[PDB]
Write a protein that binds this ligand. Sequence first.
Ligand SMILES: CO[C@@H](C(=O)NC1Cc2ccccc2C1)[C@H](O)[C@@H](O)[C@H](O)/C=C/C(C)(C)C
Ligand SMILES: [Mn+2]
Ligand SMILES: [Mn+2]
Ligand code: NA
Length: 304
Amino acid sequence: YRYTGKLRPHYPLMPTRPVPSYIQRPDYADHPLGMSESEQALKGTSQIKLLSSEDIEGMRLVCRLAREVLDVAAGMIKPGVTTEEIDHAVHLACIARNCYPSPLNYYNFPKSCCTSVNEVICHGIPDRRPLQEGDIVNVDITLYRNGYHGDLNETFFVGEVDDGARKLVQTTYECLMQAIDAVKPGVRYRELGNIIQKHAQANGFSVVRSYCGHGIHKLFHTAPNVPHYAKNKAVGVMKSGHVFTIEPMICEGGWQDETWPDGWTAVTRDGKRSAQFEHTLLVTDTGCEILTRRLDSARPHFMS
Ligand SMILES: CO[C@@H](C(=O)NC1Cc2ccccc2C1)[C@H](O)[C@@H](O)[C@H](O)/C=C/C(C)(C)C
Ligand SMILES: [Mn+2]
Ligand SMILES: [Mn+2]
Ligand code: NA
């Protein structure tokens, strides 16, 4: 393997962390290949669930608890902290909230959250690497509570970062928010990609094509697919009651990705930095409710 930049995996990984049996588990948690039979039964389809009132309540709660756990991780971002140590704290924080860490064993993913540094686009595996001053790191949290998943991420600065890092991070956040601002009933899912690319391109950045936002509720990934690039052919039209994520990955160089030999970590083929933000949204009559918003602070962590 020829690495595309300066990052390398830092092994060994800690043995798989157990989740106490009193915590309710999703179907794939005990499948040997981490396959989800409830998602596989729906691979056929592009039909979107209209959430019941009970489902909405279940989504509001798991997304609020997922925000709480992202904020714990945000608190830990400084030089010299390993991404495994951030994962360990996330794992205890989910169990404290009587939730299962949705990524753990999902398709045999080995950890409880994803930590993506610098040229990593997404799905980085927490490992022994201490964070370095100047890094940008994304922490991607998903919890499962009472049958529902809630998904969100932010990119953070490690100590002082360069001007390029600040611009990439700010533009990525603005891409996400301008796409959120367009959500309301009757808009096509395929439109959000136009909005995101337009703003990335205006700032000289590119949009990852290989990874998309997704419906989420009783399944971790389900309809609709929500691409983040322009002129995509996503199927579907937003209606009140729909829940899904928007999770744009934007890059300093070109948009092309590849995957490390570990089968998970996705990296820019050119080795340049990529940043991401994600929220889980519910469509309402007046636009949408950001289920994974902060309730007690106006801005994402990188602004503070
Ligand atoms: C960018 O990543 C998103 C992602 O793969 N979307 C795709 C849309 C979709 C639709 C159907 C099946 C898989 C997928 C993945 C993903 O949802 C993340 O937000 C999530 O936090 C990480 C999940 C693991 C690492 C546990 C997979
Ligand atoms: Mn996520
Ligand atoms: Mn997601
Ligand atoms: Na990155």
